[PDB]
């Protein structure tokens, strides 16, 4: 028992993690065979951030402007390619830790494991949602960028998350492994606005549900709600609406814990209104909303890969 | 910036991980050159989890009795030795993947990162502290023991935790990989209760200071107290009581941030005394006390 924010092992993404430098600009980029993938904004200076046209600042780089190193070890760049907001060296060498991958674009409500980064060496793993905003509440200090966020399903490292920017607030913008920013961004050094987040009802339900599982259940009532009477609620605490896909969702886990999804739902619907009441549930005082159904009966049924 | 519950990258301990079977119990074990490290409990069932005589258990047990897996690879026992609460298996092949490696013995307060394993595979990361009480809040299923909690400081995994046992509450307990247990329990089904927890008040202070790196100050107050003074407040609240050593310690922190410890504990003062009061710190409405000083530097530096 006990339920713990959980990461991914991490060891398959470290060993392709290797140190991006061109110019002034150090940051980390992504090994995988004979390709190194980075944020392109690795190119610029300072003045060119402000607003970079990307085109004339590579066409203004060589090969021989990027030093890349794999530990102790440099590699050679023996060619570069821009897609979209990643760029992409070609290198003499495959990276013999390549674990078998797939590059893959998460929705919102879905989480990820990132492996914090600085210098090709990673620091540390945590776990993250991608809010509804398109952002990740990470932490990500200078030199961070290039880290990547990933899953692991079955015979599979998923690769969903490079790291770009930071927005107001200290939440985080990136973007997949294609170079496609998750939400409105743009890889420039620009006001931008994050746009309203709110809290994702379908994943606070799942922590519910965990709860129960751990033997944590004093929040559980008597009663049950209409999905509208539920929604109703809802609206006014910022929470998504939750859709019947959402019920259907929580199918296994309210088959798991022998609880109706309306019934956990009015168990949320009192929490919200009356509040905790001085409680915890799972060591928290406030309603978690980072863990996918899916994570929770991972972490409560001991899948490993 | 942000700050975030983090652990260790894992894979340094991923290569260690192996698969122990003694009859019909299966657990992991920590390959480091050529022994494995795994609960002595392995070589029971549960007709002897109520009052288990080990050493008879092991001598009735021969090399070949028990089967170690590294992924494929059966590895050969070819010794075997019992050291406190914990199974030496010497095996015929040496771990490549064996890292710079200590073992040492964490203090209540210290925190580490475990790697949740079943059937000597990585499931899963996370974060916690050697409580007071010498309990840690994981998540361990059965399964789960002969994972190990850690700490990396360069190349060196420094392995301070075993997994053996969950106690009442869902709280779980372990040892040292020289098979000590932290805090006084005993591998055998029992009668045996953690006790109640107090706060790790040095990690609360570390992280206000974490809160204000990150440009969080609602909670700063003009005030500063002593340390007498702090600590009748803090025994009311079952918070550690504070000591020069916890004032020294927080001593980066303090400098980074400009505020003195002393001026941070009035403010812990005013938290503990008014409660957060509808407002939040990093996002949590509670105080936070899994990050020691030296995690919130690592995190708020490189
Ligand atoms: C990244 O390029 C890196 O680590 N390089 C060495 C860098 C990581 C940032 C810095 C602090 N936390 C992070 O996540 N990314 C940036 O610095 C980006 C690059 C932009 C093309 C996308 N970036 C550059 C800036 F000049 C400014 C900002 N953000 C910023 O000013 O934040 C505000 C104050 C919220 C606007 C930024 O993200
Ligand atoms: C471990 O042996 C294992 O994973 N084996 C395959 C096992 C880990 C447990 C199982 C659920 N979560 C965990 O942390 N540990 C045990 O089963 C231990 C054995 C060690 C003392 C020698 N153990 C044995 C018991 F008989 C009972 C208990 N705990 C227990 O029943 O939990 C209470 C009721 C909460 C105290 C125990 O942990």
């Keep these: 028992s006990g339920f713990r924010k959980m990461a991914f092992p991490s060891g398959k993404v470290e060993g392709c993690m290797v140190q991006v430098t061109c110019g002034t600009t150090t940051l980390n980029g992504l ?23 990307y085109e004339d600042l590579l066409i203004r780089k060589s090969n021989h402007n990027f030093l890349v190193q794999a530990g102790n ?64 509440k990470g932490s990500f200090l200078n030199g961070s960028c290039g880290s990547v966020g990933f899953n692991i399903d079955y015979d599979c490292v998923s690769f969903c998350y490079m790291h770009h920017m930071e ?34 009802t379908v994943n606070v339900l799942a922590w519910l549900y965990a709860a129960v599982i751990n033997g944590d259940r004093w929040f559980l009532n008597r009663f049950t709600t209409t999905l509208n009477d539920f929604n109703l609620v809802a609206m006014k605490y910022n929470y998504e609406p939750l859709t019947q896909d959402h019920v259907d969702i929580l199918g296994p886990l309210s088959a798991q814990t022998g609880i109706a999804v309306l019934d956990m739902c009015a168990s949320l619907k009192e929490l919200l209104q009356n509040g905790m009441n001085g409680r915890t549930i799972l060591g928290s005082a406030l309603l978690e909303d980072e863990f996918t159904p899916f994570d929770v009966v991972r972490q409560c049924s001991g899948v490993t890969f």
């Excluded at 190119?43 to 402000?50: H, K, P």
């Excluded at 390619?81 to 409500?109: E, H």
């Excluded at 090709?120 to 990740?136: D, E, H, K, L, W």
């Excluded at 294609?178 to 050094?189: I, K």
């Design 167 to 200: 927005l107001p607030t200290g939440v985080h913008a990136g973007t997949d492994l294609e170079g496609n920013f998750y939400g409105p961004f743009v890889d420039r050094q620009t006001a931008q606005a994050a746009g309203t987040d709110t809290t994702i």
């Design 31 to 53: 090994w995988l065979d004979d390709v190194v993938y980075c944020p392109r904004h690795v190119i610029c200076t300072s003045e060119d951030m402000l607003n970079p046209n």
């Design 73 to 136: 070890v440099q590699l050679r760049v023996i060619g570069h390619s821009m897609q979209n907001c990643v760029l992409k060296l070609k290198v003499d060498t495959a990276n013999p830790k390549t674990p078998k991958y797939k590059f893959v674009r998460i929705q919102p409500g879905q989480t990820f494991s990132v492996l914090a980064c600085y210098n090709g060496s990673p620091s540390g793993v945590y776990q993250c949602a991608m809010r509804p905003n398109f952002t990740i």
